[PDB]
Every structure is written in structure tokens, then in C-alpha cells.
Amino acid sequence: SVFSERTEESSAVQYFQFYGYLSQQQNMMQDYVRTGTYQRAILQNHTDFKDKIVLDVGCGSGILSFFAAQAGARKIYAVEASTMAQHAEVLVKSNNLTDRIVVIPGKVEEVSLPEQVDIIISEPMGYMLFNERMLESYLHAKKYLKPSGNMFPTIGDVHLAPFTDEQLYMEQFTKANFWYQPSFHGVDLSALRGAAVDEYFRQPVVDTFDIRILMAKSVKYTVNFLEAKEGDLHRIEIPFKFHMLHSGLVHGLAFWFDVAFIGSIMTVWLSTAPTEPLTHWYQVRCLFQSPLFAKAGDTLSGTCLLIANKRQSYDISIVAQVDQTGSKSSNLLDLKNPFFRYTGTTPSPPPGSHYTSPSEN
Amino acid sequence: SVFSERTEESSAVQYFQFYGYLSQQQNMMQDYVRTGTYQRAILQNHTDFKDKIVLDVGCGSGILSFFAAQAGARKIYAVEASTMAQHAEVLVKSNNLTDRIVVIPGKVEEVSLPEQVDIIISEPMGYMLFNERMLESYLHAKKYLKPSGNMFPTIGDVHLAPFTDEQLYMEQFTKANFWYQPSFHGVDLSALRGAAVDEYFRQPVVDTFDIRILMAKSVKYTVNFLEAKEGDLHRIEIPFKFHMLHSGLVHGLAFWFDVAFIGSIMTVWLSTAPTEPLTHWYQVRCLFQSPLFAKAGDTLSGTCLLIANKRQSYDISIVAQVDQTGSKSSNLLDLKNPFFRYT
Amino acid sequence: SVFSERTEESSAVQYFQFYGYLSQQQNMMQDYVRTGTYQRAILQNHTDFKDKIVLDVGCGSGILSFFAAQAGARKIYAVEASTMAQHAEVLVKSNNLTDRIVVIPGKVEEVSLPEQVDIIISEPMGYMLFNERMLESYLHAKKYLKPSGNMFPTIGDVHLAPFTDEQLYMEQFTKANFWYQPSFHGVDLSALRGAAVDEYFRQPVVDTFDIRILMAKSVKYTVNFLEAKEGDLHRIEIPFKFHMLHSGLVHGLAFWFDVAFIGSIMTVWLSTAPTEPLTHWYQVRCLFQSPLFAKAGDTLSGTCLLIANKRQSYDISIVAQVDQTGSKSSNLLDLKNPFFRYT
Amino acid sequence: SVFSERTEESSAVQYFQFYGYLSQQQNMMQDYVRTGTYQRAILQNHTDFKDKIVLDVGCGSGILSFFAAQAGARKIYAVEASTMAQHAEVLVKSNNLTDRIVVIPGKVEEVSLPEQVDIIISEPMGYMLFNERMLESYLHAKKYLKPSGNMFPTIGDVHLAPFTDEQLYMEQFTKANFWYQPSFHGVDLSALRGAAVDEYFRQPVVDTFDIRILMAKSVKYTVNFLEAKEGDLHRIEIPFKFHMLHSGLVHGLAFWFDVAFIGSIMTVWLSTAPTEPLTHWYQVRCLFQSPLFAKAGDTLSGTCLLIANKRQSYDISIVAQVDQTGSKSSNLLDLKNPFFRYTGTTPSPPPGSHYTSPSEN
């Protein structure tokens, strides 16, 4: 049982309890970009599925298996570890696809499949692509994949870029300064101010933002799921060298990801970039403990190291330095506990992004 | 050891992990009604604390212990199981109260105290008062209480009342109706709609509301913390008979609670009623899957039965009937997974 | 008789009893757009009537025959099957037009006319144009029309467009949810909810609406009354492909119609579109039991099939699909029993 | 069949098609006074039902049969001629009462019951009680009733009273005067004005009203369902002598009805009077073609004659005379085609009912 040795029990119980809820399945299914892009990818590459054997890793409601069924698959093994497996089976029954879709309750690391498959489908991406560590299960499932078999998605891209957001940065101190008062109902809280500040900065911020806060073209780190092994995802080192497009203070790094379905007919992309319509993954921003001043043309170099932990997530280590000035900043973050900041309000661009008089119009 | 026998470890880990965060302590402390009412209650009854030994069950940041210290307590044993305990001690030292406040890390069910105490203080109330099952720890702590000691709070009121809110009901039904689609991207989801309705309606709705949605005077169920035993909170049966003041559709039952600090000088009340300023407890509403029609003058009778579970919460069973017509409704709710509807 | 073979007696009796009431004639006549547009269409094309022989199919009060007489017709045969025929005759005499307007009581499928006519006039449009199946009588009357004769109206437009209206959908769903009750006075009705939802949603909604609910430019189905055969109206298949202009939930299809009077002098249009002044036809909406999500740029394709039945109406089957997602909806509507929602 | 002989096929078809709709059953079920009063009547007289054989004439959804089952009935024969019968059986099955309730599709005049019953229940009342002529089916069903069986309802009271309502009277001419114009789009409509007036006055008006429009205490006509024969309802002669309490113009007669359930434990009344909460029967008003002037103390004497027709309704002949003056009025009405006037607005009392200054207040 590969899964249990690399996963804390406490985390796994709640993790699979979470996905046992129909409401969450609904939440994901109602993400039109995600579901529509998967459906487009599967059906537009029907020759990759027609009369093929398919494996759906973590079928959830079973939706992707149904998409696979629409594409003409001869047999679909749909594996699911949460109680949702029982609901998926109901849908298979009610859609008269019992002869084509077989639901297998359990973890893909632990269940037995009767035969090799021609293609594996799954939706294992979390925040920052890697969150939840389901990608390792996705890669693990290749033990059931035939040589020259395919993976849907086939590759995953994670993007990095430095950003400026004075309000976001300042917000942390505004919140933490609650503890900087000598008589909260007669109690001096100040001694805990440092600890509070520390706690807030270790939280990655989940939300969206205006693309004009980005201070350099993103750096890309690619995982090829056809080529990658599980161990590749235990330690992910993403070095970066940003060529600053704008001068200003760098408050941290922004994160998003893309995945590609590379079929025989066409390649289909699913993107969570801030330039694209919002998805349920939104974007993730990691603050530096101290902002870095960089001029346009300067280089911001460093490393983002993602270290997997047993809470089905990652410890994020970011170190960055301005090569021209030696200005250096670092932060360590706990991705398992992100701060959901999104409010629905349209993000504002950084001031002043006006290069022409706003009053002439 | 108690607690471990009544609590699945997985739940407890996440539970005490949760309260180890300063941000949650801040969120609770910044609830001015709560903190201010507690401080007022403790300080105006200083004689119940003056030169006394105090036990603070779940001291968290330690705020209540500091209130106890301000009131003149001789010694306060502050028990906390989460890592917040490490932070509380820091505050005790920086406030020069080490001679009076003693932080004891661990679960109140497991720690050893040097002596019996004159009074127990705690803030163990959750959603619908009983959520989190900390009241059991609060009552459990009486093993350290002197035969004539006191408890702050002293008693707890849970109030029930039928309400009408078409908007909320259809709001939930609209969500459940997602699973009614016969062809969601070509897939028939309808077979699971019954399961979906059940899941959504099993969620208690946490928020506030205008009192004019209430269709009858509330029924009150009281827990006396001085008299109650831990075992009493494993199964809570609350019978009710409402005499309807208005005609209309009853979409469910609304819940809020009061606690009373009965001190030697005065009694101080903390209320989460919808007539009072909002607290972080808000109010809780349990929907019927189908509303019950009642005319003014009719009686709505039934029972709310709370069964404690191993996830530090309650399985809630509500059965309600219009006596004049036999119109009957039954519902099961999972308090551990509420729907936060507020703004 | 062609009429009796396609119509159950009960329906015909009720139908012609209905139009025997003066109050309905008043109701129709007081529709100023209708009456005025007919009169304008006839009078502006007076040369199509001047010294001509005219057939008025279903003359009712006789108003259109009077318009034809005003336009200078030599002789008008006014056919009416209801007892209104006796009232029309009273008006002909009191208006001193006995020499020009001849009322012939009976069904146009059954009466004998003394001669062939130069032009046929009628107002045979019902809800969604086709309701009441009077168009078939209108076309049947063409046996009396000269080879180079004309028809007023000459053509008919049926316009379809997808719409979004959460309020209407919830309004209809709320009614059907009555049957979701597990204990109505102690009785479980739920087993019938499916039958109830189906029944309510088979009702076309007759009323008006703001044009901003339309999510794509309309699709048109045209009937040319000069070219069409009666048999053409027994089965009407209307395929559609909508290019969505707005993203959102499609709750159903909106229907309205135009007719055109193509005369020698000018063409005059009568429209029941939602952009035009309201008529007694209002507009008609067919709800989906489950709405379809579509993005701007997507295509919504499908079919509206009308099958004539013996109750002087149509069984309507609407099937619609979002081509990009495979989301599919199907519905049956009984045009015979519409829901009059207008307030 | 006794039914077909007294009913034109067209009417019967339309009639039973109407009641095949769930929405129509729902409308009646949602009339709380009606349904609640029936349930109270049956349950509070449980000794009339416990271990008894029951006949439900025109069971519709079956609700009254269910009330009978709740009261402890041994066997319920539920007869229904519309397609609602198919739905009722579904409810009997889903409520696990197949052993106690037997749905019999068909007309009560045409079906066969296996045995005699102890009590007949029905809801056969129409506008002014007699509309729809369902009372005859109710009485017809007595062929299955034991010599000491009961009927629920047991009696029906029809109440008549003279009223004054100048606006209602004027409405008819306001509507009819549409036809009194010499050039409607160039056409003289005047010749049909008389016919239009006649048509409007032949319509009974269904709605409610303030009781102060009533000018005398009501006259009552009682039908005892235990004693009455079908033939008794073909011609109903209601003599009346009203002693006027108020002076004014009598514009017509107001009609409403009560039924009583006379059980072994108690008598329960269902009333549609204007002093009682509104039901879906509202009240019915029949206008005189010419109003009659009457003084307080005068007597208004005459006759209301109801003649049954084959459209499942009645032709109403009303003749009234002020005895002190000889002033006479008559009207003929078609109960089959009433005017539904109700609008939800609270009815106003006649002016001036203020005996003290409204400004005091």
C-alpha cells in the first residue's frame, strides 16, 4: 500500500470524507472551463478512446468515465476511494453503461485491476498543480498502462512570476497588529505580535489578480506525466531567473498552472492563468518576508523548492535575490493551509498604470 | 482516558490543530460582545474570585485567566490542549502574572491539578450551544471542583422556534436541483437527486435573520452546569409544543442560545438571540425538506433529539407535527458540516 | 366532412359554444392593434377588394366583412358555424349592407357557396399561430378560390428564441413541489411529484416579457397560405440552430408570430413580437423541465415538432441541445391547456 | 347509465378532463377550510368510521378516503371517473393502504361495488351548492348504502338574501355599452346592445362581498341527503319572503351554502357564508335585470327556480316583487357560465354606512 506509507491517516480520513460530498462534486462539475475542456479533449480525440480500454483514476462522480464512454471506449475501469464510488455506480446503472463502466471502490495504489489499459484519464491537479499530491497516484497508475499508452492530461506546466501588491503585503501587518496593543481588555498582547505576523506569511494566498501586478514574464516548470515517476514529485526544485519588465517592489511570487491533453487528433489545453477565465483553482500567491526592490532590466534569481509532506501537501521554500543589488529575501510556506482571499470584486491594476491622461477620454 | 474513548483521533487532531492558530484566537477575541460580556461578568462578580482558586477549562490565549487574575484570584490553573498553550504562557510572563496564572498543557480529562478549585470558568459553547462537545469537558472538570464551588457560566439556554423563509428553502432546493439534470453534458444525474436533497438539507444554516420570520414564541431547554453530568450530553431529548401566532408555511426550526453567569453580586446574561447584537455564533436554522402549513392557533408538537457522535459534534433528529392536521415532518442534520450563509 | 374527421365532437361543441358569446367578440374587437391592422391592411389594398367576390372564413361578428364592404367589395360570403352568425346578420341589416354581405351559417368545410371567390379573408391565428387548427379551415376554404385569387393574411411567421427567466421556472417548480409533501394532512403525496412536475411543465406560458431575456436572435418558420395544403398542418417540424449571444441558463423557448397581408398596393404586417404593442395573443413560452447552460458563441440546436390532435390543437415536442457540451433537453407541451400568467 | 342520460357527452368529457389535472386537485386540497373541515368531521366522528365499510364518491386524489382510513375504516371503496383514478391508486400503494382502500375507476352510476357500505362520503358541492349536478351522483350512490348508513355531508343548506350593489349593476351596462356606438371602425354596433346586456345579466357573479350590502336576513333551503332522491334535484323551487332591514335598491340575490356532517359524536359544519373565512366557492350573486326599490319594513316576496340542464348545471329563474308597491323584477341566469369577478381586494361596505363621524375618528 504505497499510499498509506506516504500519507498521515488523519489527513487521508478527512481528505476522502471531503470528496464523499455530492456538493463538492457539484462545485467542480459546475466549473464549466474544467468540465468543458475535459469533455472537449476526450471527444475531440475520439480515436484515442474508441474501442479502447480506459482507466479513470479518482472518477468521483464518474463524469470523465462518461466522457470516455461517449468517445466509444470498450471498457472503463473507474477507481474511487471515497464513498462517492457508490454514487458513481448509481449513475453507471442509471445511464445503462454497466457493460462498459466498472466502478472499483478503493485507492488506486491498493485495488486490483484485471488488465492493462490503453489510456489513463484523471483530474488530479490541486492548487499550484501539485497540492493534494494526487498526481503521484496518477503516475502510480501507470503500472496498469500498456507500453506506448497515453495519459490524459499528458503534461502539466507550473508557472512562476514575481508580483507587486502593496495592499496584500500590508494587510498581513494590519491583521497582525491586533496583537500590538498594551491593554486589550486589560491584557498586553504585544509579545505575540511577531508570532502572529509569522503565521500569516506562511499562508499562501488563494485568489485572482490583475495581470499588471506581474513584474516579469513567467518561468515554466514542466512535468511530463508520460515520462515522470512518482519520486519526481516528492521534491520539486524550480530554479528561476526573472528579467524584470517593470521597476518596483517585489512582494512575492504568483503561481498558476496549465495541463495539456495530447491526443492523436489534436492537443487541448486547460489553463488557470490570470489572463484566462477564472477556474476553481484560482491562482496562488506566496509573499516574501521582506519586499525586494528591483529595477527594470535587473534580474531576480532564486529557487522555489516544494517538499512533499504527509498531510497530502507541500512545504514551500522560496529564496530570491536581486543579482544587481544583492537584495535578498526568503519565505517558507505551508500549502496545506492556504488563505482564501477571493471576494468576487474585479481586481484593480497597480497605480499608476495610466500612461495617458484619464481625463482626455 | 475520557475524551479519547468518545472522540475519533482524526477529528481531535484537526480540532486542536485548528485552535493552535493565532488567527482563530484573534477572531474569537475580536468578538466584542463575547469577550466584553465575559469580562463584565467576571469583574462585577469579583467576590466569587477574590483570593480564590480558579480553573480555566480551555484557556486558549489565556484571556479568561487574565480576567480571573484582574478579579483577584489567588491562583488560576489554565488548561489548554492545543499548541496555543505555548503562546498563553508567553502572555502570562509578559504581563507579570506568573505568580497567579499557571498554564497546564494538556487535555482537562488527562492533566493533574495540585489542588481542588473554588470556581471553574470556560467558554465551551459552540453552534447550537452543544457543538464541539466541549461542554462535556467543562462538566468533566467538576472533578476538580469543591463541593460548594461555582461555574462561570452557570446555566445554558437553548431556544427553539418555528420560522418561515421561502427564500432560504428554495435557495437550498435550487442547489439540490443540480442533480435533477437529465443531461448534464450528456449525463443523466437525476438518479442521485434524492441523495443530493438529503445531503444539502442535512446542513444546518448558520447566519442571522429578522425575528419576524418566527411563527411562535420560542421553547426553552435549560442545562444547569452545576447539576448536570457529562453523560447527560450524549443524548439530548428536547420536546416542544409551539402555539402558532401566525398562519403560514413553517420551513424549519431556528436555534440560538443564552448562557448565564450567576455570581454573588449579580447575574450576567450572554445571548446569541436574533434580537441582540451579532456574535460569532450567529444563529442556526434547521430546514424541513418540505414545509408544514399551520394556521394561527394551531399547535406544532414534536421532538429535537441530539445524539453525540465521535467527530465532536451531534447527529440532530427533528420531528415536528401539526397536531390539528397530522401534517408531519422529520429531518436528520449533521452539525459538523454547517452551511455558512452569512453575507 | 373534413372537419368532423379531424375533430372530436366534444371539442367542436365547446369550441363553437365559446365563440357564440358576444363578450368574446367584444374582447377580440377591443384589441385595437388587431382590428386596426386588419382594417388598414384591407383598406390600403382596396383594389384587391373593389368589385370583387370575397370569402370571410369564420366571420364572427362580421367585422372583416364590413371592412371588405368598405373597401368596395361587390359581394361577401361570410361563413360562421357558431350562433354568432345570427348576430352578424343583425349587424348587416342595421348597417344597410344586405345587398353586399351574405351570412352563410355553418362550417366552411360543409357549406355550399354560390360561386368561386377572388379573395379569402380570415383571422385564423391562435396562440403560437397554430392553436385551434383554424388555419386548416382557412386553407380548406381555398377550394372556393379562383386560380389567380388572393388570401388575407397571405403568409405566417412563427418566431422562436431561447430565453432565460429563473423567476418563471421557479414559479412553476414551486407549484409542482406541492406534490413533494411526505405528509399532507398525514398523506404522502411524493409518489406523484414526477407526474405533477411533468403536468405543470407541459403548460405553455401565455404572457409578455422583456426582450432582454432572449439569448439569441430568433429562428423563423414561414407558412405561405397561398401555397400550403391543409395536410401540411397535420405535422409541423421546425428545426432550429441558435447562435448564443449571451452566456447563461436557457430555461426554454419563446414563441411569437407575424402575419403578412400581401396586397397589390402594399404589404401590411401584423406582429405579436415582444418589441411591438401587446395583442390578445401575447407571447408564448415553453419551459424546459431542466435549464440548459450555454456560453456566448455556443450553438443551441434542435427541433420543435407539432403533431395535430383531434381536440383542435397540437401535441408539441421540443428537443434542444447545446452542441458543444451535449447537454440535452426534451419536453412535451399541450397547447390545448396553456397557463395564462399575464397580470 | 343514469349519468349519460342526464348529461351531454361534450360536457361530461370536458368535465372529467378538467378533473384529470393534478393542479385542479391541488387547488381544492389547498383550500384549508374545506380539507381541514372534512378531516375534522371524519376524525372527530371516528366511531362512524372505525371498522366500517365506506364509500367515497368521486375520490379524486383519494384524500377523503385517507381521512377515512385514519379514522379506522375497515374498507374504503373509492370511485373515480376521471383519469385522476390512476393517480389515486398510486397514492394508495405508496401509503401502504392497498389492503384497506380499493380504487374503482368509473362513474358511480356505472361501477359495481362488491358489497353494501356503512357510510358514504363525498365532496359534491358546486357553486350555490347545486352546480355541476354532482349531488345527484352522491344521492345515486345511496343504492349501496345500508338502511341505517350515514352520509357525510348529511345535509346541505342553501342561503339566499337580497343585496344592494350599484357598481356591480352598473358594470354590466358599462361593458354592454361597448356595442352602443354608431361607428366602431365605421360599423354601427348598436343593434346588438340589447343582446349584449342580456348576455351579461345571465351570468352569475362569483366573488365575495361585505355583509352590509345585504338588505334582509337570509332565507334557507335545506336538502337532507339521507332522505332526498335524485329526482328531487332536477327541479328546485325556492320560495322566499324577505323582510327588508334596510331601505334601498335591491339589485339582486346573493347565494351561499352550508353543509353539515351529522356524526354519532358531534355535528361539524362547513360554511361558505360571507361572515366566514373565504373558500374556493366564494359566494354567488344573481342580478335582477331591473333593480327593485324597497323600504325598511317592506316585504320582498318571490321565487327562485333552479331547472337542471344537460350541461351539468342549472337554468336559474328568479322572480321578485315588492309586496307593498307591486314593483316586479325577473331574471334568467345560466349557472354553467358564471363571471369570476374576485380580485383579492377587500370588499367595501355600501355608502354611507357611517352613523358617526369618521373624523372623530
Ligand SMILES: N=C(N)NCCN(CC[C@H](N)C(=O)O)C[C@H]1O[C@@H](n2cnc3c(N)ncnc32)[C@H](O)[C@@H]1O
Ligand atoms: N482538487 C481536485 N482537483 N479534486 C478533483 C476531484 N476528483 C476528480 C473527480 C472527477 N475526476 C471529476 O472530474 O468530476 C478527485 C477524486 O479522485 C479521488 N481520489 C484521490 N486519490 C485517490 C486514490 N489514491 N485512489 C482513488 N481515488 C482517489 C478522490 O476521492 C476524489 O473524489
Ligand SMILES: N=C(N)NCCN(CC[C@H](N)C(=O)O)C[C@H]1O[C@@H](n2cnc3c(N)ncnc32)[C@H](O)[C@@H]1O
Ligand atoms: N465554540 C467556542 N467559542 N469554543 C471556545 C474556543 N476556545 C476558547 C478560548 C478562550 N477560552 C477564550 O475565550 O478566548 C476553547 C479553547 O479551549 C481548548 N479546548 C477544547 N477542549 C479542550 C480540552 N478537552 N482540554 C483542554 N483544552 C480544550 C481549545 O483547544 C480551544 O483552544
Ligand SMILES: N=C(N)NCCN(CC[C@H](N)C(=O)O)C[C@H]1O[C@@H](n2cnc3c(N)ncnc32)[C@H](O)[C@@H]1O
Ligand atoms: N384567437 C383568435 N382570434 N381566433 C379567431 C377568432 N375568430 C375570428 C372572429 C372574426 N374574424 C373577427 O375578427 O371578429 C374565429 C371565428 O371564426 C369561426 N370559425 C372557426 N372555425 C370555423 C369553421 N371550421 N367554420 C366556420 N367558422 C369557423 C369561429 O366560430 C369564430 O367565430
Ligand SMILES: N=C(N)NCCN(CC[C@H](N)C(=O)O)C[C@H]1O[C@@H](n2cnc3c(N)ncnc32)[C@H](O)[C@@H]1O
Ligand atoms: N367544485 C368542487 N369542489 N367539486 C368537487 C371536486 N371533486 C372532489 C374531489 C375529492 N373529494 C378531493 O377532495 O380531492 C369531485 C371529484 O369527484 C369526481 N366525480 C364527479 N362525478 C362523478 C361520478 N358521477 N362518478 C365518479 N366520480 C365523479 C370528479 O371527477 C372529481 O374528480
